[PDB]
Amino acid sequence: NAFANLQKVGKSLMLPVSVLPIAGILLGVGSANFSWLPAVVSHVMAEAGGSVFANMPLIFAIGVALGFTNNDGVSALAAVVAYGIMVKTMAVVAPLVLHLPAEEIASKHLADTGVLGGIISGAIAAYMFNRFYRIKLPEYLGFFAGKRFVPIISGLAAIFTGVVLSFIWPPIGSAIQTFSQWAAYQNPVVAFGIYGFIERCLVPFGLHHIWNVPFQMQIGEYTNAAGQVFHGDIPRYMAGDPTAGKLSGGFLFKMYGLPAAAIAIWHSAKPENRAKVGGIMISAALTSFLTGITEPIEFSFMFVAPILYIIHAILAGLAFPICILLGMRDGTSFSHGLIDFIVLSGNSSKLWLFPIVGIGYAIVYYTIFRVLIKALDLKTPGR
Amino acid sequence: NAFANLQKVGKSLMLPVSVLPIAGILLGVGSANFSWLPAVVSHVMAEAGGSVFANMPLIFAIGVALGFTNNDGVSALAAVVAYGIMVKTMAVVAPLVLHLPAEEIASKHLADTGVLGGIISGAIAAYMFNRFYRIKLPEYLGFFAGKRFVPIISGLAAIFTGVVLSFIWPPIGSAIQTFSQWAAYQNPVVAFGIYGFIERCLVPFGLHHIWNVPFQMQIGEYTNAAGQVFHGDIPRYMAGDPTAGKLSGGFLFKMYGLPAAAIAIWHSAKPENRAKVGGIMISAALTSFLTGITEPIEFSFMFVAPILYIIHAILAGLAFPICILLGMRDGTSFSHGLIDFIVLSGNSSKLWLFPIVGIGYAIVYYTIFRVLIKALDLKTPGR
Ligand SMILES: OC[C@H]1O[C@@H](O)[C@H](O)[C@@H](O)[C@@H]1O
Numbered sequence A, B: 001n002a003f004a005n006l007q008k009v010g011k012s013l014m015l016p017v018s019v020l021p022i023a024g025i026l027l028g029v030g031s032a033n034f035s036w037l038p039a040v041v042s043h044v045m046a047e048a049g050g051s052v053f054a055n056m057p058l059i060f061a062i063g064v065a066l067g068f069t070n071n072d073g074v075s076a077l078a079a080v081v082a083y084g085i086m087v088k089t090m091a092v093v094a095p096l097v098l099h100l101p102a103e104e105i106a107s108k109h110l111a112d113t114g115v116l117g118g119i120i121s122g123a124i125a126a127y128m129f130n131r132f133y134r135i136k137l138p139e140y141l142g143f144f145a146g147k148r149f150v151p152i153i154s155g156l157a158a159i160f161t162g163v164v165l166s167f168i169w170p171p172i173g174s175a176i177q178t179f180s181q182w183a184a185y186q187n188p189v190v191a192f193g194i195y196g197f198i199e200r201c202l203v204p205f206g207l208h209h210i211w212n213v214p215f216q217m218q219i220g221e222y223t224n225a226a227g228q229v230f231h232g233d234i235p236r237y238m239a240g241d242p243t244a245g246k247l248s249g250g251f252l253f254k255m256y257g258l259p260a261a262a263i264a265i266w267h268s269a270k271p272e273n274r275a276k277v278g279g280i281m282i283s284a285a286l287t288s289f290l291t292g293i294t295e296p297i298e299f300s301f302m303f304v305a306p307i308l309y310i311i312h313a314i315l316a317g318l319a320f321p322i323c324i325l326l327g328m329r330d331g332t333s334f335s336h337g338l339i340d341f342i343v344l345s346g347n348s349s350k351l352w353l354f355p356i357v358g359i360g361y362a363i364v365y366y367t368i369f370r371v372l373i374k375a376l377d378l379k380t381p382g383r
């Protein structure tokens, strides 16, 4: 009744994340500002990737809507209408509930529900479709009947849902902002262990993107002589600073660890399901290794095997402190994949340690996965 | 097979405009600033409607994608991704072509395809879907094989379409601008008379949706106090533009004229077939009066009495000039019925003249249809 629903949601979130790898590749290639690509190229590609990642919530809404409606386009249109209505009404009503002057809400992001808003809107659309796509109205009202009725009720519900969330969410956003702001002033290693663990926790319900902004873009600051200012870790690194690369722990589990988890899941299938599982696992591992997108791998075992995801999260959190301790410097554009690992080489210090610690993390991930899956008989993809 | 494909375009365009009723309700009853609603409710409804309208190009893209792909949702996702990428690519490439700062272009909407650009994005999505929805990508790349590849290649083609559009737009944009200025502010009388006549002539086939797209979504340019810019006639009236409301002549022949024609057809039926025809024609008259859907009435006699349809087309074409000249302003969501008349009356002007001109139209239609069917001996339903 609920576990099946969560499994459905995870399964339907796959088509939305099928486009993320290419957007990530485009953004990473463009943001490098290569010395050979004409600027208009690496401008257009960067903007395209940014557009995909900005519409991410809408893609998620459409994917959720089609997941529970047997891939019906009317559900997607209703989802788009509902998402727009919900976002605008939330923005409008939040400053009145919170009595802040309509600007601190956007500056501090207390009304940006992120991808979870897409999920809510898509669920609204799917439920309304499932309930009203065969609605029989009187003949003189026949035009607004059947699937034509769904986009109206989906949006009449969106306005009310946005009104509801404008009161139940700023407490959540305010909390996710304070801690995630307390985490910076916290000692260095503690700060980024917290970052890694909480990001792994948050990615499932689509607001780790909100979590990242403070630590990617705002934690730091640096301006050397004639150079311009840069106020974050992701930018300060690509800005060749001497102390960014505090997010260099992403490579350990996004290029070496989760691929190992994917292969471990692959090698623990049924005597015949191996062939079918292998292709998807290999594709997911390749995507994670290359473009630094881990959602295809995580969503594949997250809901069936929550303990594996908790162990993941602990490992990802552990990755950042060790990389800081050894020094392990290498930066990011949007994620931590091969393309970013290479193009942002720049001032990547101690960059030879990444392959070996990555092999260690692959060993550990594979060991825990193939041990726990066999022991508890978890029905990960293939079982 | 051009006729079938044009009808396919017509229905693909009908779908996007079918979600206009929700924006109608919200924005029309919000921007009216009714004294019986608290101001916050009006603000919230107005912004929700504005959000629905700001995605009109996106809804058009989704509708085009679904119409040509047998309602497949992956087409809608491809349409969203492609539209976003195309818009951003144009935004970055147009200043190269026009040799003007991007700030000025963004401020004065020089690079703004609008609903047309939404249609291009939807066409891209539909084409790439129908061509690559059974692709067999390599075994290790199976995570993207199939419908998962359609959004990928659609978004890839979006960049190229965006550059091509940034190169070939200026003339198209200037041409549209001049119709958008003649049809709205120079000669609305003759422009909308032509509109009415052509739409009546195109209804028998289903291409009136193509004929309406410009007049209902392109002409004009209005900016609310909030700063959102509105285009078309329906959005312009809903926003509160004093110069909108040109499509208000639909009420004269949809609410008063065609119901009169239906009653005339019923009253001219033979005795043995006056009860049955009475039921059918009352149903059709109610459908026209309330919703604004006129095809049950017009199909009753159009193929068995074309001359009556020519007279009706002339009268409908004359309706729009008459309103424009007498100042009778009132908006519509999708068609001209009773509900649209009542709900979109906030920004209306001279709403009292509508019933009087309407009873005039009803008398004219009734007398014309009765006398002509009696003399010419037309075999309209019943005879
Ligand atoms: O969601 C796409 C990517 O966003 C990045 O910011 C995160 O670090 C990755 O874990 C994630 O795969």
Ligand SMILES: OC[C@H]1O[C@@H](O)[C@H](O)[C@@H](O)[C@@H]1O
Pocket: B203, B208, B212, B292, B293, B294, B295, B334, B335, B336
């Ligand atoms: O068919 C749907 C409706 O489309 C409108 O644009 C036309 O004006 C009506 O005559 C028609 O009923």
